[PDB]
Amino acid sequence: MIQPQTYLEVADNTGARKIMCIRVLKGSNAKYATVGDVIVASVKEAIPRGAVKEGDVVKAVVVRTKKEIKRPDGSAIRFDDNAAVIINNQLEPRGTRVFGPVARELREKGFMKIVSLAPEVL
Amino acid sequence: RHLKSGRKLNRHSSHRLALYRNQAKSLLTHGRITTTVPKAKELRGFVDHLIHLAKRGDLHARRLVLRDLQDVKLVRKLFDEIAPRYRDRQGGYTRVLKLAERRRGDGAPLALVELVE
Amino acid sequence: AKHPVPKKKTSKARRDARRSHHALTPPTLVPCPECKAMKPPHTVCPECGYYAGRKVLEV
Amino acid sequence: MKGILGVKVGMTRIFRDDRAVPVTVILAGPCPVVQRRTPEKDGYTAVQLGFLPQNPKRVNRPLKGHFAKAGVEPVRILREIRDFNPEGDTVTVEIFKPGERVDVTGTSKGRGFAGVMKRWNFAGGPDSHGAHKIHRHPGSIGNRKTPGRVYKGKKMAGHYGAERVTVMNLEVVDVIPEENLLLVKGAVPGPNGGLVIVRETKKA
Amino acid sequence: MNRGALIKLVESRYVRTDLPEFRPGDTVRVSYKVKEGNRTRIQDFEGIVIRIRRNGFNTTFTVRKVSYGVGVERIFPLHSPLIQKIDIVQRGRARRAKLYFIRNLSDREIRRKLRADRKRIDQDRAAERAAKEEAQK
RNA sequence: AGGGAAAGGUGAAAAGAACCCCGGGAGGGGAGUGAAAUAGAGCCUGAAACCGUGGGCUUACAAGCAGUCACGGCCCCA
RNA sequence: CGAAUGCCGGCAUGAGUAACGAUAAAGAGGGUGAGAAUCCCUCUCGCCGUAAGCCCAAGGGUUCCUACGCAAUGGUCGUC
RNA sequence: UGGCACCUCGAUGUCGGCUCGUCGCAUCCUGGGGCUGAAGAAGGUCCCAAGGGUUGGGCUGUUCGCCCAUUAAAGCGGCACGCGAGCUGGGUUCAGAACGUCGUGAGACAGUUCGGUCUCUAUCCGCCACGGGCGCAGGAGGCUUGAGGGGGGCUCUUCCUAGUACGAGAGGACCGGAAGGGACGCACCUCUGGUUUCCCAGCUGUCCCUCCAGGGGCAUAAGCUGGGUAGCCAUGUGCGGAAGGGAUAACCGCUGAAAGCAUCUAAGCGGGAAGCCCGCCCCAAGAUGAGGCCUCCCACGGCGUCAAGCCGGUAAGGACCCGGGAAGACCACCCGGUGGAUGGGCCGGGGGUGUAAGCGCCGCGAGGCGUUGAGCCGACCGGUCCCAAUCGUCCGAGGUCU
Ligand SMILES: [Mg+2]
């Protein structure tokens, strides 16, 4: 469960390596974020050149968590880390790639391109 | 809401354990014992079970009892002389009965614990 | 000696009124069968005793 | 108003269509109507059933065989069902069909003398920095000279639980007529082996 | 009334009795997966089994993969949309019930800690006994 | 260095209660001394606060600086 | 004398209320006695061990040992 | 912010924060409405309306403010600038020290700087909970009626009606219908996930039982480590605000004179809000106005200012003592007491650990193999009279009247 101050790994080549939740973009007072939810972040380390730079204030979508998610079918799924992918205000990846698996909950939330670009959907 | 559960307890683990072990060593040594009701009503099952292990009599059950009682001498008596006297009995190897009158000391109501026959 | 303290002497009347419920209870007793005596029920008692059980003296 | 008496047995979950539904199993055994309330002599309209039948004849004054179906007044007694007047001859489960909606009364588990911040979910005070003797306390309970007293109803600590509680609008998942069974959509008040009554809901 | 239990055991009329008998060894298997306005397509999850937790019906188990960079854990009800369930290597030789222990120092060191259970292998081979006797019996 | 309390009284005469009874004792109950023993021993007289037992009147839909004025009921010598 | 947060003494209220002075820890069976959770004996259990063991100096002044005792002193009981 | 100095100097704790709230409306959102320099969408402005809501961080002791990122909105005030016998003590404000600065000096500065003792026991009122006594004009065992209280009342986005009314287009509705969210409320333990103080294993030091093997204590009040049923729980599950009926606020009308016209009004009649009343959930006849329905038990037996104001046995019933409880501080409440499965044991199943000990075989040895999913096993679902609820005792009408 992701919240303000949580460090996420980034699974795309926008150049940035790690970001940090600033706010979660559900209602007026939403407590936490999970897969398929949209956050604001700031960047905290980057790889040299690339569109995105340390210090930059960005948008992201959550694609993996460490707290298992519960399927309505009555099964569940959990990953070794908390990762995300960097989005533009018109909601597309600004990457041309994504590394490591992703949760199918994305597909129910409309994050199609990410899903098709992904190397695996669990 | 503590207690929706059971197994009653005063003192702390290491001590409480040892109490039952000593009280038992007493019953098996003396056939009848006298204490407070609650101490008695607990000692009940802890002792029944040692009796029942001595019925099946196998080296294992021997070594199993040596853990709580600790005298080799005493355990022989347990297997050899006490166990037989039951054998056909299915449980209830022990009785609790309440005397009249307390210690003029602390007002504590007493009882006695008989090995049954 | 410290913070909270009584404002007024409690009056004789209100003293005793507290004590309406302090009254005592007589112990509950039955006649010892198999011997002439009183004893509290569910008890072994030493003028007498039981049957398939222990008691005082027999010579 | 459809309405049986019954008892919580326990819960688990089943599958449906293609997903797990949580369910809680009620035993709403056969409920022999023993008295009808008329508006002509009682003033109100209702029916008095009975439940757990079993009784080794300890029945004295309320022997009241007086209504034919006196077949041993139940251990778990008898409750009225307000405006409900059937074909007077026992009520089994058949009244409720799967997919119907029900309200369910019950007796919540008992927490006893409960602290505020359970009884009422208060914040209490900090586990560290300043004080140490008020981690779980309520803090303030008033103002000063005006009004110079505490409000009737103030939330403070006290007895919590063991109370009448109706949870509204549960789904009837299933009904085993065979065993006098009733399946509902999870979460019904009190412990196992507790009396509950089960009615129609009020929905839309 | 009396069996608050056996009543519940009665509603459990959805039990399964066909799926391979396995424990903290090395299964692998299939699924259900919806999308695309269809309910169809089976997906396979191959991995080490970390935990089995028993409770009559509704007992569950969980399986551990490394997908690409990342490791993964999945949790299964042991009942319903699991078509097949065949298993890779009944090795295990686990010395304990839960072995989450592996997550932290999982690599090639896993392998020396989880060798093959020759014993339980030797009786999956020897459980071959298919009565070969057709037009022969 | 120095500071510095509390605490008097049986009876004319000990005649200071032999002996018996309940109690481990302490106490009591009979008996006996004395004009008197609620003069029995930190005992003359023994006031007040304070604590008991017994008896008459009185109170569980009321509300008060606790009293006063007026009727009315009950209880005791007219 | 009714008042001086007056002085001396006596008895009330709070009240059967807070407390009973290290969280090293107890159990049973025999004695003795008018009376025993609290004394004596035995068997289990726990705590200290550069000590919670042993030997001197200071200070204390019979607390040492024994026989008879239990009103009081002992934070309960007490035959100790 | 001040003026005045009336109670308080044999004491009325003083800024800011936290905890817990409650009330005002002069309304920040959401609900009705009138104008508009209202095409639509989006505003402006005033009227009715608190029922509920009114985010998270950076700086500073801060109140306040500025700033980051969001929101339907990030409302203004009162309650001793609410709340220190409820907590804090960063700020002004005791004693130490220094800088600037004024003073010959001792010393001084809401100027700066670093430091600096916040009290176990609630008598009355009040509040949250729980019992005892009497009453309810016969004495009982049950089931109810609801006078009158309390709880709850929020809100967004996307799809469809349609990119159609409107349109200088460059955008975009009313009315009506669906689907997901956010917080908050009651209850629950199937699932997910915690705890699980001795339920099961593994390990080190040391002392011991008995030399090997096997075990016990101590290393916490669990030595350490790896797991972990029941219960209790939130990060987990299910439900909830509502439909609906009646009366209204601003406001919009019908019919209609005074006043031959016109007017919502002066006689009458209709519409009309997240608001009012009732409806939903909970408490409730000490509602001394003590209610109602079903069923039971009835005899004067012996004496006064003759129906208890009488004592002693009854009746239907009820206590006492006992075995227990997802009930519980005590009490109360519920269930049982041999005509019995209430607790304990014992037997089966669930559940947890994860192949006991002993023997045999392989290795010089540490060890390894088989026997074996073995051995041990709290709470959960049940069975079975082996142990224990033995035997008994005490209350309790005999019911004045038109
Ligand atoms: Mg100054």
mmCIF file with all atom_site columns, N, CA and C (backbone and C1' of nucleotides) and ligand atoms in Angstrom, chain H residues 92-93 109-110, ligand 1:
data_model
loop_
_atom_site.group_PDB
_atom_site.id
_atom_site.type_symbol
_atom_site.label_atom_id
_atom_site.label_alt_id
_atom_site.label_comp_id
_atom_site.label_asym_id
_atom_site.label_entity_id
_atom_site.label_seq_id
_atom_site.pdbx_PDB_ins_code
_atom_site.Cartn_x
_atom_site.Cartn_y
_atom_site.Cartn_z
_atom_site.occupancy
_atom_site.B_iso_or_equiv
_atom_site.pdbx_formal_charge
_atom_site.auth_seq_id
_atom_site.auth_comp_id
_atom_site.auth_asym_id
_atom_site.auth_atom_id
_atom_site.pdbx_PDB_model_num
ATOM   1  P  P     . U  H 1 92  ? 11.648 33.261 25.083 1.00 0.00 ? 92  U  H P     1
ATOM   2  O  "O5'" . U  H 1 92  ? 10.812 34.290 25.978 1.00 0.00 ? 92  U  H "O5'" 1
ATOM   3  C  "C5'" . U  H 1 92  ? 10.091 35.373 25.341 1.00 0.00 ? 92  U  H "C5'" 1
ATOM   4  C  "C4'" . U  H 1 92  ? 9.134  36.080 26.279 1.00 0.00 ? 92  U  H "C4'" 1
ATOM   5  C  "C3'" . U  H 1 92  ? 9.571  36.248 27.725 1.00 0.00 ? 92  U  H "C3'" 1
ATOM   6  O  "O3'" . U  H 1 92  ? 10.343 37.421 27.981 1.00 0.00 ? 92  U  H "O3'" 1
ATOM   7  C  "C1'" . U  H 1 92  ? 7.289  35.553 27.626 1.00 0.00 ? 92  U  H "C1'" 1
ATOM   8  P  P     . U  H 1 93  ? 11.799 37.305 28.636 1.00 0.00 ? 93  U  H P     1
ATOM   9  O  "O5'" . U  H 1 93  ? 11.516 37.496 30.189 1.00 0.00 ? 93  U  H "O5'" 1
ATOM   10 C  "C5'" . U  H 1 93  ? 10.499 36.726 30.780 1.00 0.00 ? 93  U  H "C5'" 1
ATOM   11 C  "C4'" . U  H 1 93  ? 10.955 36.122 32.071 1.00 0.00 ? 93  U  H "C4'" 1
ATOM   12 C  "C3'" . U  H 1 93  ? 11.041 34.605 32.041 1.00 0.00 ? 93  U  H "C3'" 1
ATOM   13 O  "O3'" . U  H 1 93  ? 11.530 34.055 33.264 1.00 0.00 ? 93  U  H "O3'" 1
ATOM   14 C  "C1'" . U  H 1 93  ? 9.018  35.242 33.048 1.00 0.00 ? 93  U  H "C1'" 1
ATOM   15 P  P     . C  H 1 109 ? 16.355 44.341 32.565 1.00 0.00 ? 109 C  H P     1
ATOM   16 O  "O5'" . C  H 1 109 ? 16.375 44.964 31.104 1.00 0.00 ? 109 C  H "O5'" 1
ATOM   17 C  "C5'" . C  H 1 109 ? 15.191 45.572 30.554 1.00 0.00 ? 109 C  H "C5'" 1
ATOM   18 C  "C4'" . C  H 1 109 ? 15.415 45.967 29.111 1.00 0.00 ? 109 C  H "C4'" 1
ATOM   19 C  "C3'" . C  H 1 109 ? 15.285 44.839 28.093 1.00 0.00 ? 109 C  H "C3'" 1
ATOM   20 O  "O3'" . C  H 1 109 ? 13.902 44.601 27.751 1.00 0.00 ? 109 C  H "O3'" 1
ATOM   21 C  "C1'" . C  H 1 109 ? 17.294 46.073 27.728 1.00 0.00 ? 109 C  H "C1'" 1
ATOM   22 P  P     . A  H 1 110 ? 13.296 43.123 27.884 1.00 0.00 ? 110 A  H P     1
ATOM   23 O  "O5'" . A  H 1 110 ? 11.777 43.344 28.307 1.00 0.00 ? 110 A  H "O5'" 1
ATOM   24 C  "C5'" . A  H 1 110 ? 10.689 43.639 27.410 1.00 0.00 ? 110 A  H "C5'" 1
ATOM   25 C  "C4'" . A  H 1 110 ? 10.685 42.828 26.125 1.00 0.00 ? 110 A  H "C4'" 1
ATOM   26 C  "C3'" . A  H 1 110 ? 10.104 43.608 24.942 1.00 0.00 ? 110 A  H "C3'" 1
ATOM   27 O  "O3'" . A  H 1 110 ? 10.778 43.089 23.800 1.00 0.00 ? 110 A  H "O3'" 1
ATOM   28 C  "C1'" . A  H 1 110 ? 8.956  41.631 25.084 1.00 0.00 ? 110 A  H "C1'" 1
HETATM 29 MG MG    . MG I 2 .   ? 12.311 42.241 30.645 1.00 0.00 ? 1   MG I MG    1
#
